[PDB]
């Protein structure tokens, strides 16, 4: 599988996002961008906006 980084782990095709200090979240898209404002992530190529959603 994929080692999140000495701690958690996810399945093939998943992505490890460190939205915490000791916790890891499973997100889609390899080069995805994990929204750190709150608790989210978006497909590689998008950005987090103030509209709660992601833009391009």
- Domain extents in the chain: 1-56
Q: How far apart are CA 18 and CA 15, in angstroms?
A: 10
Beta bridge partners of 54: 48
Determination approach: NMR
Strands 25-27 and 9-10 come out as unpaired
Residue 46: Cβ within 10 Å count: 16
CA 43 centroid distance within chain: 9
Nearest to 33 by CA among 55, 50, 13: 55
User: Can you say whether residue 49 is alpha, beta or left, with left for phi > 0 and alpha for psi between -120 and 50 degrees?
Assistant: beta
Name residues whose C-beta falls within 8 Å of residue 52's C-beta, 6 or more positions apart in sequence: none
CB 43 within 8 A of CB 28: yes
How far is 28 from 34, CA to CA, in rounded Å? Answer: 10
């Amino acid at each position: 599988d994929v080692q999140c980084g000495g701690g958690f782990s996810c399945h093939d095709g998943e992505t490890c996002c460190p939205t915490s200090q000791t916790t890891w979240g499973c997100c889609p898209s390899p080069k995805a961008v994990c929204c750190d404002d709150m608790q989210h992530c978006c497909p590689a190529g998008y950005k987090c906006g103030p509209g709660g959603t992601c833009i391009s």
